[PDB]
Amino acid sequence: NLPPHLLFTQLSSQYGPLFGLYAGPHLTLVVSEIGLVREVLLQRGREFAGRPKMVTTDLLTQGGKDIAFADYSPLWKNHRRLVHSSFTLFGEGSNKLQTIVQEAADSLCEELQACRGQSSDLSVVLMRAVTNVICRLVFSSSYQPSDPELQTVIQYNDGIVQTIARGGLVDIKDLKRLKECVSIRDQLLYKKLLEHKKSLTPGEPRDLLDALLIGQQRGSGGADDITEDHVLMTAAEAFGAGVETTSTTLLWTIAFLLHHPQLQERVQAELDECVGVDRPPCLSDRPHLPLLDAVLCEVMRIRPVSPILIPHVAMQDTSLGGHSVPKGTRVLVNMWAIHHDPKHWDQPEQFNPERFLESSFLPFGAGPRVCVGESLARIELFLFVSRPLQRFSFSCPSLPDLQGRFGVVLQPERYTVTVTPR
């Protein structure tokens, strides 16, 4: 009838913004209002920082050794501290990410030239580009578009997406097809991991994978220290969490610029004044591109990639609203609600980047469980989007459907778009 994110958004008007669903022994709360969600993420962030141990996830994360589906704990804090710093170093700390992402936007731009004068479907092409970026950032891969090993990775990532899309988080088989995908994935990375452990300079540099292995190098004894399996799982997750979210956010951006050609022209003016028409845009231009940033913020608001977050589990007996919340309780954060709440947003259903130009905006979550790839994401999307807008104009050749479909993320239905440069 109606997807859960809209259903509970819709019920929040008449009945409350906190809803309790029952199934089996576990209570499941759904939270559709900013104060409540802030209570879960920030205010009692630590209490609700647990994750649920499903069987798909176990396969995925070799038993909860990743970041996303592991419980808050001494081991998980060191692990994430290790991760967070790794990313910071590659993005803010220097220009390895900038370079990776610029040089990839080249390839992407080049691929698009050749697609003129078609009414191409991009999505594959972008998928490729963001996947390549993450291959680069994690292994120092040097694949070009045609490369078969890159093609392997997209194919096992793709299989995992397809598999999960049909089936379970079981919030609210064929589980063998995942194991298969997972195995080829686990092996290929491990190989890369072996290749990396052999050539390893701690001072620096040269890779997210290096950076974890160093961190794991410094690994006194069991209790709260990361094994090597977490390194591998964290590398796998950089794709798992990073590709489909980033590619989709790009797919929406473009989808919306088709509906708003004027706005696409306005951002293109911004780029022309501020950046050359030759120079590639780089991170230092960010402050000087206020509209673009607005556009990006708006896309992330209006079509949240995960309109319901992965559950937050109640680590101890706690409370929410003024209501007690037993240990083990699952809490679904309704990202669509808080991003479409008319109490907090004027014309929340209209695409208006100007609303970010002049509070309950949490595109990356927040609190202990906040996105660990936020800095990387933001840089990815800035760099990617400035370049194609600088080099290309995207028009309709009937306009794409902006409702959205739920794969493993919320995403627009496949569309054709005319791609035209200068």
Ligand X SMILES: CC(=O)[C@H]1CC[C@H]2[C@@H]3CCC4=CC(=O)CC[C@]4(C)[C@H]3CC[C@]12C
Annotated binding site for heme b: 51, 312, 369, 371
Closest CA to 157 of 236, 233, 63, 235: 236
Name the amino acid, one letter, at 162: Q
Q: Does 377 bind ligand HEM (CB under 6 A)?
A: yes
- Residue 420 phi/psi, 5-degree rounding, is -140, 130
Stretch that binds ligand X, among 159-167, 264-272, 320-328, 341-349 (CB under 6 A): 159-167
Q: Which amino acid belongs to residue 77?
A: K
Among 7-15, 22-30, 239-247, 286-294, which window interacts with ligand HEM (CB under 6 A)?
239-247
- The C-alpha atoms of residue 370 and residue 362 are separated, in whole angstroms, by 9
Which structure tokens are listed for 11? 């019920």
305 touches ligand X by CB under 6 A: yes
Q: Does 375 bind ligand HEM (CB under 6 A)?
A: no
Burial of 397 (0-12, 13-18, 19+ CB in 10 A): exposed
Q: Based on the shown chain and the rule CB under 6 A, indicate whether residue 42 belongs to the binding site for ligand HEM.
A: no
Q: Which residue has the tokens 């950076």?
A: 211
Asked whether 86 and 208 are in contact (CB, 8 A), the reply is yes
> What's the closest the beta carbon of residue 160 comes to ligand X, in angstroms?
4
Angle between helices 74-91 and 96-115 in degrees, nearest 10: 70
Closest contact distance (angstroms) between CB of 169 and ligand X is: 8
- From candidates 207, 237, 293, 341, binder to ligand HEM by CB under 6 A: 237
- What span, in angstroms and rounded, lies between the C-alpha atoms of 169 and 52? 9
Beta bridge partners of 411: 405
Exactly one of 100, 126, 164, 254 binds ligand X (CB under 6 A); that residue is 164
Residues 337-396 that bind ligand X (CB under 6 A): none
Q: Which of 61, 78, 163, 249 binds ligand HEM (CB under 6 A)?
A: 249
Closest listed residue to residue 240, CA positions, set 388, 399, 48, 408: 408
139/210 Cα distance (integer angstroms): 8
Dist. CA 37–CA 160, nearest whole Å? 30
Return the one option of ligand HEM, ligand X, none that residue 369 interacts with (CB less than 5 to 8 A, by type): ligand HEM
Q: Which of residues 269-308 bind ligand HEM (CB under 6 A)?
A: 300, 305-306
Amino acid in position 199: S
**Which residue type occupies 190?**
Y
Q: Is 68 in the site for ligand HEM (CB under 6 A)?
A: yes
What is the separation, in whole angstroms, between the first and last Cα of the chain? 46
Q: How many residues bind ligand HEM (CB under 6 A)?
A: 23
Question: In the complex, which residue's CB is closest to ligand HEM?
Answer: 373
Best CA proximity match to 222, nearest among 75, 81, 69: 75
Closer residue to ligand X, CB minimum distance, 280 or 367: 367
Asked if 306 interacts with ligand X (CB under 6 A), we say yes
364 touches ligand HEM by CB under 6 A: yes
Shortest distance, CB of residue 305 to ligand HEM, whole angstroms? 5
Binding-site residues for heme, in ranges, read 371
**Is residue 131 a contact residue for ligand HEM (CB under 6 A)?**
no
Q: Is 244 in the site for ligand HEM (CB under 6 A)?
A: no
CB hemisphere CA count around 364 (13 angstroms)? 15
Taking the complex as a whole, the smallest distance from the CB of residue 278 to ligand HEM amounts, in Å, to: 28
Does position 361 interact with ligand HEM (CB under 6 A)? The reply is no
> Tokens 């609700």 belong to which residue?
48
**206-238 b/e (C-beta count within 10 Å ≥ 16 → b):** ebbbbbbbbbbeeeeeeeebbeebbbbbbbbbb
Q: Does 411 bind ligand HEM (CB under 6 A)?
A: no
Residue range at the interface with ligand X (CB under 6 A); choices 86-94, 156-164, 338-346, 352-360:
156-164
- Cross-strand partners of 421: 392
Q: Summarize as ranges the residues that interact with ligand X (CB under 6 A).
A: 68, 157, 160-161, 164, 240-241, 244-245, 305-306, 309-310, 408-409
Q: Summarize as ranges the residues that interact with ligand HEM (CB under 6 A).
A: 67-68, 237-238, 241-242, 245-246, 249, 300, 305-306, 309-310, 363-365, 369, 371-373, 376-377
